[PDB]
Amino acid sequence: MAPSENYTWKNVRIDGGGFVPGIIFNQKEADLIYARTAIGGAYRWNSATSSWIPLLDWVGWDNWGWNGVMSLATDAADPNRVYAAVGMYTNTWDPNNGAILRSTDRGNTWQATPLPFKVGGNMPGRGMGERLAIDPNRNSIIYYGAEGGNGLWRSTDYGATWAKVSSFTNGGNYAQDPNDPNDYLNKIQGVVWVTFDPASGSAGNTSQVIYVGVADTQNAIYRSTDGGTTWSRLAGQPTGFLPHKGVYDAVNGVLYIAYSDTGGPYDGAKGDVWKFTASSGTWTNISPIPSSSSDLYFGYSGLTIDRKNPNTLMVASQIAWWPDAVFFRSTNGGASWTRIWDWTSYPSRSFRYTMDITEVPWLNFGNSNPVAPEVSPKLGWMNESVEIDPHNSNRLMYGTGATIYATENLTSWDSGGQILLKPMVKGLEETAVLDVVSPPVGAPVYSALGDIGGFRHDDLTKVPTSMYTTPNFSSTTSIDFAELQPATMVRVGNLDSGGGIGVTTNAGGSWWQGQNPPGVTSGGNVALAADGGAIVWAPGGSTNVYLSTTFGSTWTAISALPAGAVIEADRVNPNKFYALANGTFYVSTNKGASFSATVTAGIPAAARKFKAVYGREGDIWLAGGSSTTTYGLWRSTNSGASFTKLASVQEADNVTFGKAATGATYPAIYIIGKVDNVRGVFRSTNEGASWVRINDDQRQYGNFGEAISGDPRIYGRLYLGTNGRGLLYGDSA
């Protein structure tokens, strides 16, 4: 067994960067707040440090889908208890079923009960909820609205065991696109929320009245009046739409429901907000703008009630992409509303809010000259979760596709003032890291991220001012620096429907955009010669890989390389480039103009990660494989002429190098992999002869390791990319 060494793991500070489909306040305990994410686990707010604490970093390599958090419930009767429904996809992309996780210590530790079906924390419909709900009068009882047509599920033993509720017989019939050939939009979204009437029981006794939301346009709302023994469609309900939210107020005895014509979170063209009064059975359409009006171009979600003053409620657009989201507020139970912005004289608007992003300045997306009617930063989008603090009428929080915004002066709206919104995402690190580099001079690390581009990180403790611009990719798929002239850098990535390339000669002080070769539909990957004098780019979509000798102004096709081959430059000899594709290794000795196959056997076809070593010409390490084929770590010391498998590694998925141990003759090597039957993150300081585990079972981060980098200046340091937990750095303790 590889021994473990004590390490300190932190996030490189970005603040947010991903979608928060759910914010959940505990109804009895003030400042107890959780957030659920689509791909990056769940978090608990720590009010003493003003930061979020991740709760699911123990999810590892084989159960990686558990970082998908489709619902979370926090127990009002016992605030130490918390539950989460987990799993990431309901198609083939997650090979595993979902689970309900249960905790008696606020998510410090958990136990899992696997479900007999999949959970879709990053599927369509994931902003509808909460599907998981605890009986507020009898906390042994929990319900889960399942996806897929599996219907309504229940535990009566504090989450330990779960079974289908036989008497609930509508599992839902809506998929966003039932004929999607991509097999992503075509899954039944199912039973979407469970909401109790707390006045229908008392501490210790089963709540008799329960409402359930179903993604069925003709049967959206069900009710039990006998503690879930029997269920019936609620009479007199509206039809034609899907209920994103169902929020019940026992003070006035009213169920509010926000509907949309799709499951969300990316779309929604029509919907309504309805009010059901339980005492009389009355239905009222309280839509700020009803779907019968041609002025309405979004559905509704973001439904929340002010628990301290329950005549006050809010709802929001699901979805207004243009000109921005709108939020609506009523203080008289929906009889009338005002809106957070208004047209004054088109394209100008008046606003009931201001926004301060000085703690997360990249949220303007590098745009400080937006064209009216747009502003920058925007109010938001994918704003399915909007929540008034049940202990403080002045606090509200909402999730977007990029952040959590919060206000602490919400009732200023009601006196004609402007609420202040600010990000509230310190510690909540949700980005997918696609590539990462650590040069030997200047800033310690550069990130290449999905959705927000990525950054030069001048200080790992300080949020970068802006993502890369000119060009500004949505996702940077690959970045490189010229080993011998590190201020020269290149990056490729995704831009409005296609791809492109950005180059720089002052280490990203400023970039400019190069021209494209034919057929580019996405960034793919790129390599920069060691002296900065050539670029080899394998774009997505293109039929070829291309060379530039003009720093991206012009290109020429490379005849031998398959489309999309993984390219790496030698870090010493500017004339050497390498490529890997599907079991074949290829080398160029003429600075990228041509390549030739050198190895066609012994390398697993699945391997797609390799790297040349700084300071060591022709020294290459290669990681990959699969459990059905062959798997491990290979090394060449002859510029790719041949590879030797390391006997010390059972499986490896990526490899990088950093500063040598004092006295050692070779850089430290870091891998993502399996060594002596243990999965994790390993360091070798003797050329791969033996390994030390530098992570631990609480710090596994799921499907991590697509991008890793050692640090040539700092012994022991590893920049560890994740898919949903940002960019970590680990240091020897």
CA distance 246 to 303: 8
Asked if 186 contacts 178 with a C-beta cutoff of 8 angstroms, the reply is yes
Residue whose C-alpha is closest to residue 518's, from 538, 495, 542, 497? 542
- Shortest Å, Cβ 367 to Br ion: 19
With contacts defined by CB under 5 A, name the span among 11-19, 117-125, 298-306, 337-345 that binds K ion.
298-306
Q: What's the token pair of residue 716?
A: 């022991």
- Shortest Å, Cβ 260 to Br ion: 13
Q: Which residue is nearest to K ion (CB)?
A: 298
- Shortest Å, Cβ 191 to K ion: 25
- Shortest Å, Cβ 298 to K ion: 4
- 317 versus 385: smaller Cβ distance to Br ion: 317
Type of residue numbered 476 = T
- Shortest Å, Cβ 269 to Br ion: 8
Type of residue numbered 410 = L
- 192 touches, from Br ion, K ion, none (C-beta below 5 to 8 Å by class): none
- Shortest Å, Cβ 17 to K ion: 24
CA distance 304 to 327: 11
Q: Residue 733: how many CB atoms within 10 A of its CB?
A: 9
Interaction between residue 266 and Br ion (CB under 5 A) = no
CA distance 287 to 305: 15
Tell whether omega for the bond before 265 is within 30 degrees of 0, i.e. cis: yes
Q: Return the residue of 9, 298, 353, 682 that touches K ion, per CB under 5 A.
A: 298
- Shortest Å, Cβ 319 to K ion: 5
- 718 touches, from Br ion, K ion, none (C-beta below 5 to 8 Å by class): none
- 321 versus 666: smaller Cβ distance to Br ion: 321
- 209 touches, from Br ion, K ion, none (C-beta below 5 to 8 Å by class): none
- Shortest Å, Cβ 319 to Br ion: 6
CA distance 55 to 58: 8
Q: Which residue is nearest to Br ion (CB)?
A: 321
- 269 versus 484: smaller Cβ distance to K ion: 269
Residue whose C-alpha is closest to residue 365's, from 491, 455, 447? 455
- Shortest Å, Cβ 320 to Br ion: 5
- 158 versus 321: smaller Cβ distance to Br ion: 321
- 135 versus 324: smaller Cβ distance to Br ion: 324
Looking at residues 266 to 295 of the shown chain, list those that interact with K ion (rule: CB under 5 A). 269
- 378 versus 608: smaller Cβ distance to Br ion: 378
- 248 versus 328: smaller Cβ distance to K ion: 328
Query: Please, what is the end-to-end C-alpha distance for the chain in angstroms?
Result: 21
Which whole-number Å values give the CA distances from 295 to 193, 259, 320, in the listed order?
A: 28, 16, 12
Assign 629 to helix, strand or coil. Answer: coil
Q: Could you tell me where the beta strands, DSSP code E, fall in 582-701?
A: 584-588, 596-599, 609-612, 620-625, 631-636, 644-645, 651-658, 668-675, 678-684, 692-693
CA distance 654 to 671: 6
Looking at residues 534 to 563 of the shown chain, list those that interact with Br ion (rule: CB under 5 A). none
- 269 versus 660: smaller Cβ distance to K ion: 269
Asked if 258 contacts 239 with a C-beta cutoff of 8 angstroms, the reply is no
Interaction between residue 248 and K ion (CB under 5 A) = no
Interaction between residue 322 and Br ion (CB under 5 A) = yes
- 191 versus 242: smaller Cβ distance to Br ion: 242
- 242 versus 569: smaller Cβ distance to K ion: 242
Interaction between residue 321 and Br ion (CB under 5 A) = yes
- 322 touches, from Br ion, K ion, none (C-beta below 5 to 8 Å by class): Br ion
Asked if 321 contacts 264 with a C-beta cutoff of 8 angstroms, the reply is no
Looking at residues 389 to 448 of the shown chain, list those that interact with K ion (rule: CB under 5 A). none
Q: Binding residues for Br ion, how many (CB under 5 A)?
A: 3
Asked if 655 contacts 636 with a C-beta cutoff of 8 angstroms, the reply is no
With contacts defined by CB under 5 A, name the span among 158-166, 262-270, 475-483, 546-554 that binds K ion.
262-270
Q: Could you tell me where the beta strands, DSSP code E, fall in 173-281?
A: 191-196, 210-214, 221-224, 232-233, 242-249, 254-260, 273-277
- Shortest Å, Cβ 380 to Br ion: 13
DSSP assignments along 168-201, one per residue: --------S-TT-TTSSS-S---EEEEEE-GGGS
With contacts defined by CB under 5 A, name the span among 55-63, 318-326, 484-492, 555-563 that binds Br ion.
318-326
Residue whose C-alpha is closest to residue 421's, from 439, 403, 437, 409? 409
Catalog residues that contact K ion under the rule CB under 5 A. 269, 298
Catalog residues that contact Br ion under the rule CB under 5 A. 320-322
